[PDB]
């Protein structure tokens, strides 16, 4: 927090906590899926899946491999978007909406393209 500020640090730590809990639950999930988890754990697992998909990005150097051009997300927008994710504000949207995109505008566009809406 002394360097990147309180908000950025808080959002990053919350994201890391959610992903760590998902990693912990991997043992149960590999066998029984999400069904036997508590409602808190089910919610956190869905949130963690969305977060881990949203950490992916269409890189500039990846256009050679897939044709799709890259994207640049400003740091403030990244903090805002991941704060929204960690709060469960995008639970309704499908997982694939968060895959290989940029900021929140791209999220809305891909959610629309998938039949949902932000």
């Amino acid at each position: 927090p002394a360097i990147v500020g309180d908000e950025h640090y808080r959002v990053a730590q919350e994201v890391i906590r959610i992903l760590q809990r998902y990693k912990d639950l991997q043992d149960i999930i590999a066998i029984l899926g999400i069904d036997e988890l508590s409602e808190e754990d089910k919610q956190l697992v869905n949130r963690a899946r969305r977060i881990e998909r949203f950490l992916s990005q269409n890189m500039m150097a990846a256009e050679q491999f897939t044709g799709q051009p890259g994207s640049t997300v400003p740091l403030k927008e990244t903090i805002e978007a991941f704060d929204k994710l960690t709060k469960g504000e995008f639970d309704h949207l499908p997982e694939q909406a968060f895959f290989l995109i940029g900021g929140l505008d791209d999220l809305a566009k891909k959610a629309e393209s998938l039949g949902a809406k932000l």
């Binding site: 730590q13 890391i16 906590r17 992903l19 760590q20 809990r21 912990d24």
Partner: protein
């Protein structure tokens, strides 16, 4: 002779007798484990040399438990002798209790005793969280562990335990600041000091505001056609 390398170095940290001046040297060797493998060579040697260890884990660190002490396997081989009397009193079985709590939480992934133990352990785990570069005086730590192990955190939500601790310590430092002085001077928490501390905690609890808003005192739809209707059958033409 790598074990000897470390042992002859670490045995020079000692507490001298009063004949030799009574001076002392405390050692804090650091060891980097790989993939959380405390069964490697150097980790085993140094663990078998030193007077206990504070094992730090990355899983606990990522979970928000910071410092990431693994209470189950962390231990001090001096024990209560290395604490002031007040800390001994408030924090007698804290490490043992937290180890038992982690065991129960793992097993109970229930009777009233189990739920009480789980809630107390969650509160205590929250209590021991501490940010970097925010040290606490021994008296403040005594008061915090008193909050924890004396049952005064049971009425506060687990999420507010850290904020409740910080605000109560600030209040005691602002007013009722003689409890800290007593713990500093006497190294022990007097009966009257405990009475005053309990009363102050109760009053602050009355004043304390929960994050949710309480007091810590003491989807798309079925197509209406799809909803199958339970209908009695009548053998008549409609009127």
């Amino acid at each position: 002779d790598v074990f000897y390398l470390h042992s002859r170095l670490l045995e020079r940290c000692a507490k001298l007798s009063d004949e030799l001046g009574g001076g002392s040297m405390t050692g804090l060797p650091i060891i980097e484990t790989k993939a959380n493998d405390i069964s490697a060579f150097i980790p085993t040697n140094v663990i078998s040399i030193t007077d206990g260890q504070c094992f730090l884990e990355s899983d606990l660190f990522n979970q928000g438990v910071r410092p990431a002490i693994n209470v189950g396997v962390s231990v001090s081989r001096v024990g209560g002798a290395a604490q002031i009397k007040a800390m001994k009193e408030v924090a007698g079985s804290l490490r043992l209790d937290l180890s038992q709590y982690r065991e129960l939480e793992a097993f109970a992934a229930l009777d009233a005793a189990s739920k009480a133990q789980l809630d107390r352990g969650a509160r205590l785990v929250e209590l021991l969280k501490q940010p970097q570069y925010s040290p606490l005086a021994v008296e403040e730590q005594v008061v915090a562990i008193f909050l924890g192990t004396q049952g005064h955190l049971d009425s506060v939500p687990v999420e507010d335990v850290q904020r409740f601790e910080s605000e109560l310590l600030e209040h005691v430092k602002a007013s009722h600041s003689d409890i800290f002085d007593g713990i500093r001077e006497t190294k022990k928490l007097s009966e009257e000091a405990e009475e005053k501390l309990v009363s102050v905690i109760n009053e602050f609890k009355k004043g304390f505001q929960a994050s949710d808003g309480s007091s810590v005192v003491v989807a798309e739809a079925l197509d209406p056609e799809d909803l199958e209707k339970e209908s009695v059958k009548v053998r008549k033409p409609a009127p």
